[PDB]
């Protein structure tokens, strides 16, 4: 059925981190925490569960590249609603700092998603095959083993407004056909799409069950227990 689903913090925090080593987790999940580098090293060293990998924010070069992979984070996020509003990262900038990263043998997370504007214009489709083509177009079909599709609508990134899930599951469809079409059945089969967007410890049961579905990508609820029961609803 699915592949191996994964559920991402997107950075007390110390109480957090007790907390979540505490847990135990049963199924097959991936846990991550992304952080910024001022806290990356406490996280690297007070983060201990089997679970849990932690992921870096962003990467200004290969100097930065090196020396994140010196330190063990093996993980990074890439193209986060932010950074394509207010740091000049198009969609071609994004692609390329996909490729750089996959090139030096990171596993990536690659953010995509519409804006209210772009939604309520009728042009999501668009939007999303847009930005995802970029992406696609320095990839070859090896590397897509290196790929994590996170589909963020950015009206719904700490808004407090979540994707119905007939929304969320319509997104990740398109997606993933177009994968399949485009790069191979393989492939799509294999690719974890991730939902972020608002996703809480009530919402989150119901989007995972979504056919398409693999897992979320968590702000606000991941600076809370109910983190953990976000990585629950992936069971």
């Given at each position: 059925?699915?592949?191996?689903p994964?559920?991402?913090?997107?950075?007390?925090?110390?109480?957090?981190?007790?907390l979540?080593?505490?847990?135990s987790?049963?199924?097959?999940?991936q846990?991550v925490?992304?952080?910024?580098?001022?806290?990356?090293?406490?996280?690297?060293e007070?983060?201990?569960?089997?679970?849990?990998?932690?992921?870096?924010?962003?990467a200004?070069?290969?100097d930065?590249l090196?020396?994140?992979?010196?330190?063990?984070?093996?993980?990074?996020?890439?193209?986060?609603?932010?950074?394509?509003?207010?740091?000049?990262?198009?969609?071609?900038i994004?692609?390329?700092?996909?490729?750089?990263?996959?090139?030096?043998?990171?596993?990536?997370?690659?953010?995509?998603?519409?804006?209210?504007?772009?939604?309520?214009?009728?042009r999501?489709?668009?939007?999303?095959?847009?930005?995802?083509?970029?992406?696609?177009?320095?990839l070859?079909?090896?590397?897509?083993?290196?790929v994590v599709?996170?589909?963020?609508?950015?009206w719904?990134?700490?808004?407090?407004?979540?994707?119905?899930?007939?929304q969320?599951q319509?997104?990740?469809?398109?997606?993933?056909?177009?994968?399949?079409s485009?790069?191979?059945?393989?492939?799509?089969?294999?690719?974890?799409?991730?939902y972020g967007?608002?996703?809480?410890?009530?919402n989150?049961?119901?989007?995972?069950?979504?056919?398409?579905?693999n897992?979320?990508?968590?702000?606000?609820?991941?600076?809370?227990?109910?983190?953990?029961?976000?990585?629950?609803?992936?069971?």
């Open positions: 059925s699915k592949p191996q994964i559920a991402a913090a997107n950075w007390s925090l110390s109480e957090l981190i007790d979540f080593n505490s847990t987790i049963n199924h097959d999940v846990c925490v992304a952080s910024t580098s001022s806290h990356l090293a406490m996280t690297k007070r983060l201990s569960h089997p679970k849990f990998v932690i992921a870096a924010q962003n200004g070069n290969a930065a090196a020396s994140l992979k010196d330190f063990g984070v093996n993980w990074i996020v890439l193209g986060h609603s932010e950074r394509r509003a207010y740091y000049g990262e198009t969609n071609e994004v692609a390329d700092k996909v490729a750089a990263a996959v090139a030096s043998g990171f596993m990536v997370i690659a953010c995509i998603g519409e804006t209210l504007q772009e939604r309520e214009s009728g999501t489709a668009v939007v999303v095959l847009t930005q995802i083509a970029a992406i696609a177009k320095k070859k079909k090896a590397d897509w083993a290196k599709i996170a589909y963020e609508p950015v719904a990134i700490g808004t407090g407004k979540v994707a119905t899930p007939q969320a319509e997104a990740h469809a398109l997606i993933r056909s177009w994968v399949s485009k790069i191979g059945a393989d492939v799509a089969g294999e690719l974890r799409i991730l967007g608002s996703v809480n410890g009530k989150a049961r119901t989007l995972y069950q979504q056919r398409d579905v897992g979320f990508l968590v702000g606000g609820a991941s600076l809370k227990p109910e983190f953990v029961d976000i990585i629950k609803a992936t069971q």
